[PDB]
Swiss-Prot record, chain A:
Name of the protein described by the UniProt record: Ribosome biogenesis protein 15
Span of the signal peptide: none
Keyword terms of this UniProt record: Cytoplasm, Nucleus, Ribonucleoprotein, Ribosome biogenesis, RNA-binding, rRNA processing
Cellular component annotations (GO), alphabetically ordered: cytoplasm; nucleolus; nucleus; preribosome, large subunit precursor
Source species of the chain: Saccharomyces cerevisiae (strain ATCC 204508 / S288c) (Baker's yeast)
Note: Present with 4280 molecules/cell in log phase SD medium.
Protein localization: Cytoplasm; Nucleus, Nucleolus
Outcome of gene disruption: Essential gene. Abrupt growth arrest prior to substantial depletion of ribosomal subunits. Fails to synthesize the 25S and 5.8S rRNA components of the 60S ribosomal subunit, and exonucleolytic 5' processing of 5.8S rRNA is strongly inhibited. Arrests at cytokinesis and fails to assemble a contractile actin ring at the bud neck.
GO molecular function: ribosomal large subunit binding; RNA binding; rRNA binding
Record text on subunit structure and interactions: Component of the pre-66S ribosomal particle. Interacts with NOP7 and RRP1.
Domain RRM: 4-82
Lineage: Eukaryota, Fungi, Dikarya, Ascomycota, Saccharomycotina
Any GO BP annotation: maturation of LSU-rRNA from tricistronic rRNA transcript (SSU-rRNA, 5.8S rRNA, LSU-rRNA)
From Swiss-Prot, chain B:
Biological role stated in the UniProt entry: Component of the NOP7 complex, which is required for maturation of the 25S and 5.8S ribosomal RNAs and formation of the 60S ribosome.
Subunit composition and interactions: Component of the NOP7 complex, composed of ERB1, NOP7 and YTM1. The complex is held together by ERB1, which interacts with NOP7 via its N-terminal domain and with YTM1 via a high-affinity interaction between the seven-bladed beta-propeller domains of the 2 proteins. The NOP7 complex associates with the 66S pre-ribosome.
Family: Belongs to the pescadillo family.
Full-sequence portion shown in this chain: 88 to 460 of 605
Superkingdom, taxonomy of origin: Eukaryota
Compartments reported by the entry: Nucleus, Nucleolus; Nucleus, Nucleoplasm
Domain BRCT: start-end pairs: 185-273
Name of the protein in question: Pescadillo homolog
Region Sufficient for interaction with ERB1, residue ranges: 1-284
Curated annotation (Swiss-Prot), chain D:
Protein name as it appears in the record: Proteasome-interacting protein CIC1
Cysteine pairs bridged by disulfides in the record: none
Note: Present with 45900 molecules/cell in log phase SD medium.
Keyword annotations of the record: Nucleus, Proteasome, Ribosome biogenesis
GO molecular function: identical protein binding; large ribosomal subunit rRNA binding; proteasome binding; protein-macromolecule adaptor activity; ribosomal large subunit binding; RNA binding; rRNA binding
GO cellular component: nucleolus; preribosome, large subunit precursor; proteasome complex
This protein's encoding gene: CIC1
Taxonomy, superkingdom: Eukaryota
Role according to the record: An adapter protein that specifically links the 26S proteasome to its substrate CDC4 which is one of the substrate recognition subunits of the SCF E3 ubiquitin ligase complex. Required for turnover of cell cycle regulatory proteins CDC4 and GRR1. Required for synthesis and nuclear export of 60S ribosomal subunits. Required for vegetative growth.
From Swiss-Prot, chain E:
Biological role stated in the UniProt entry: Component of the ribosome, a large ribonucleoprotein complex responsible for the synthesis of proteins in the cell. The small ribosomal subunit (SSU) binds messenger RNAs (mRNAs) and translates the encoded message by selecting cognate aminoacyl-transfer RNA (tRNA) molecules. The large subunit (LSU) contains the ribosomal catalytic site termed the peptidyl transferase center (PTC), which catalyzes the formation of peptide bonds, thereby polymerizing the amino acids delivered by tRNAs into a polypeptide chain.
Gene encoding the protein: RPL8A
Assembly behavior: Component of the large ribosomal subunit (LSU). Mature yeast ribosomes consist of a small (40S) and a large (60S) subunit. The 40S small subunit contains 1 molecule of ribosomal RNA (18S rRNA) and 33 different proteins (encoded by 57 genes). The large 60S subunit contains 3 rRNA molecules (25S, 5.8S and 5S rRNA) and 46 different proteins (encoded by 81 genes).
GO process annotations (BP): cytoplasmic translation; maturation of LSU-rRNA
Further remarks about this protein from its record: Present with 238000 molecules/cell in log phase SD medium.
Organism ancestry: Eukaryota, Fungi, Dikarya, Ascomycota, Saccharomycotina
Residues of the full protein shown: 104 to 253 of 256
Any coiled-coil regions, as ranges: none
Name of the molecule in the record: Large ribosomal subunit protein eL8A
Organism name: Saccharomyces cerevisiae (strain ATCC 204508 / S288c) (Baker's yeast)
Similarity annotation: Belongs to the eukaryotic ribosomal protein eL8 family.
Amino acid sequence: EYSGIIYVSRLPHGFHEKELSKYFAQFGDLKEVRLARNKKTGNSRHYGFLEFVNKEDAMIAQESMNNYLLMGHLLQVRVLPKGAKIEKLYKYKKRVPVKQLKDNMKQKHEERIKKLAKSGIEFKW
Amino acid sequence: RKLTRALGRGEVSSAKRLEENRDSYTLDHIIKERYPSFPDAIRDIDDALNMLFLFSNLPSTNQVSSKIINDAQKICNQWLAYVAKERLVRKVFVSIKGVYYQANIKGEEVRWLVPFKFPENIPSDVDFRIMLTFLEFYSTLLHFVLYKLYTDSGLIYPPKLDLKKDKIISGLSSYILESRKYDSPVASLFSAFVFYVSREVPIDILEFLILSCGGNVISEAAMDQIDMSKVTHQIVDRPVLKNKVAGRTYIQPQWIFDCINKGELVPANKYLPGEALPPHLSPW
Amino acid sequence: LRKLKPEGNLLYDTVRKLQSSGKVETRVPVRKGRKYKQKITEKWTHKDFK
Amino acid sequence: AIPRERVIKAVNELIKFTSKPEEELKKDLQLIVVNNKSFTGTSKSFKLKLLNVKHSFYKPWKEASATAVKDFKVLLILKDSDIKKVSEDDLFDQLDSEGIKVDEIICGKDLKTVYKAYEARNAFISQFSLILADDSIVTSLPKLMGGKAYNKVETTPISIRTHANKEFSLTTLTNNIKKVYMNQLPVKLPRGTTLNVHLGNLEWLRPEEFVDNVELISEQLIKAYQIRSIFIKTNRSPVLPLYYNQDVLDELEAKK
Amino acid sequence: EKKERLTKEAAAVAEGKSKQDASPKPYAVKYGLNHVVALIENKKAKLVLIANDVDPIELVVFLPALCKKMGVPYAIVKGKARLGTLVNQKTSAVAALTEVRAEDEAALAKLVSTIDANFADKYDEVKKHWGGGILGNKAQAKMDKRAKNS
Amino acid sequence: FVRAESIVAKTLATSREKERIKRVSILEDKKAKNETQHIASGKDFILKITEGLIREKTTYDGKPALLFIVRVRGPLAVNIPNKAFKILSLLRLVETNTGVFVKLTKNVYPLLKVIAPYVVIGKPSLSSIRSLIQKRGRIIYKGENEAEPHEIVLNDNNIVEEQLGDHGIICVEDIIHEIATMGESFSVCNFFLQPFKLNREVSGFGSLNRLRKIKQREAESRTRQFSNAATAPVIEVDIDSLLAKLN
RNA sequence: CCUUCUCAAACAUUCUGUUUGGUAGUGAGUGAUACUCUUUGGAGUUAACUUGAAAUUGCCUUAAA
């Protein structure tokens, strides 16, 4: 038999933790919610997780929204076995001397030149 | 019902088709059988004109359908332009509830109101659709009788109105007259006069009187968007007045009221405010 | 005359003229009213969706 | 500037290198790269810097895709008011004479209606290699067509002076498209310091024309962005220094 | 719309001299029952719709079986006037879709993927179950009190 | 219940509004800072839409003038942003189909540019303002009574004396001249006037008037353009013809 | 169940030329060529290739009722 945790999928844009919380409050008191945001130019990879409190709340929500529709994604949803222990996905926003390095440039210029020379593709300079 | 069926089923092109393809009702046969025709009509138009000039002033909201209002305003101004161009007013009496008039139009002397142009407030205790229906009947009535009037005078009925005038004043300069002596003496009083009215006083009742008693006019407020060449008179109801000039007498409208109400053309001696007034000297 | 505040509601007064001159009966516009409950209950379909 | 004989022997060196050791298609197309001081940071522009060139390679490209299967070809996307104004008869009068041909004409309402279905969107546009869009539209596009087009420079859009100020008529653009086809080419500018450019391919025009073309763009780029150093490869090879400027290197911490 | 199309195309064929194809192609549902069932067994449908509420049910019972056989994604809509709303008839009792403008190809293709999600597994349980085994409240309370006492 | 489709469309609409308001606000910030190397176009523009319709674009080069505006509902999903809630709460245009006048300038132009999708705009005529103020208009007034859950229609110019005699102002006709000719500073009047509660042009929900609602929505979504370009012109109409319906 | 930053200047007229600036994205991944930084922490830049928008875990009031 299952756990209260749920897996969801195929989310569209504009659908965030606030939307999940306010929507799925209706199917009972929600314990905690979390979705999948990118850690780079932070936007969703269109899935998430939730447990409202209960196994029965989870399964009735799944029975309702198993193949639910909106514009041209459609939500699929999975009740899990016991536990399954949401652990991760901290929320991520959109993350935002001269002569010494000149000698470094000057020497590694020669280094790349000898590297292409010993490939071997011969070169002056 | 058909339209409702249509809009439930969609079919909005068909709904427009239904609405354009209908022929609503008219009341010409009702009038021209109920009133035989002319003297009775002009006798009993008074209660019509009262409610019309009321509805032209009161505000638009639900229960109003302000197309109604602009129609009533149009026929009101048509009526006023006809009677003022043909120079018939016989009494005037200012009061708190607007002003009553009196005119010997083709025999019987019709008395009627034109209220003050101000934002009255509504009870929401009166029942309205009855009064609207009254108005629709009266509007049709006046449309018929006024067509008859313009025609028997001989005139281009109904009057066009130039938008550049309508957008500045929306007055009696609008609804311009095109054809196809007088009441002797009280027509053509102020003959060859010019009144520069101050902005301070409301033209809403000055201009019917002034144009009935023939004389040209210019307003202060009229030139807000855009000469005093031959101006003869100045009018104001302000305590202080400046820079007053010698070309004009600086007078009050009770002068006009007494002048037409007695047909005497009293001087402007008891005038040039802020001296007090000969109080109203009502006709009754 | 700028001082002049008009007074008296022409709606009330002309309606008095209407009721006075024997054209119309004296009346309220009075708003809605029901005698019985017009009972609510649930459709068959919502009742048996199980 | 670069020694032109160094440029000559460099291109000879590249072609004789790649002459002998999908694979050749991946490994033959020429790329040219440049480092600069630093590019415009925290500002993701998507315009393309248009260089002037004397010999374009798109005529070889159509000549090569006539044999190959990819069918190198053009796109042209317009404002909504314009497809009714324009037709294929006019370009049939104009462009076949000087010897090219447009493939189709299309609008943005069609972009947002029939080139949704993102699969079908990318499948549609990946057929196209060369993209021409309006100055008016270029800002609006990336909400419409999406970054799959913009990562690749083939798909990535470009403005064009369409509107003869005002009340656009065709000829002011029909000559401009001839100019940008035959005598100008794009350049992209990413974040950071590095900038690669898909110059062309080795089966297209000879080294004797490629050499003065690269000389042209290099001399107009050294003045443009205060570039750091210049290299080349074809799609695996290590970087070939043909201009390594050092007076440009000393002002970097002077900026600080 | 037809008569506007005709008064267009009469001038179009009189002056422009087309083949009566100057006007464009239509893209529309196809709504006669015999039309539908003829198109099926040519497999010229991508979605058909079926109305539950038909008392002459013999008209309709063969359709889901036949659509299953020909592998076409049937669907039983609730309401026949609902289907008439989109043909401009009172009742149609079916509608179909065979050819679409490109801008809803994904819409249709995904709609099919919803429909078979709603039906393909439900087909096993619809047929093994004889509906309508239900009693009224008095008999129900009778047997409930009997089970309670026993 | 809360219509999940409506939830997500609401989120998208408010996010799009957030994008465009931030866009134009920071645009105007860098305009005022005058570092104008990277801006698409450095000047205002004015589209005077008139009557498939007739379009005329122009620039301000103020030459200041006045305008009259109305809150219209929309667009169509949005839970509002603070960065227009504060503005229109100051301007007293919420509880919509409400009218207020305004004096135009460069301080206030971009405020029109942000509020524009929520609102309809155009200049009035002398007849139109005269009709408006003689038919409509209200006052908050205090003394000897009346702890102000209060409203008063204009019927007394002695109120204009006792509240604007300090300005040397009586005579709401004289107020109207001040307004129409842009006389002495326009601002006691704007802060005072208790702005106009106009009427919805069509009540209905009979099968007839529903049709007029649909035609009305066709007309407004035709004439208005929520282009959100951040360089697009302002929109201006025949208000003289419109408030004939709306008054 | 919305629907997308769909033009601005300068010049001299060529209805047409030069320059100017104007976009921060569906995501998932596939392997892979080179450049900066600074301390290992790799952050950012660099060829092209698939996927039905795919998927399980990377500190305001009439748009009401």
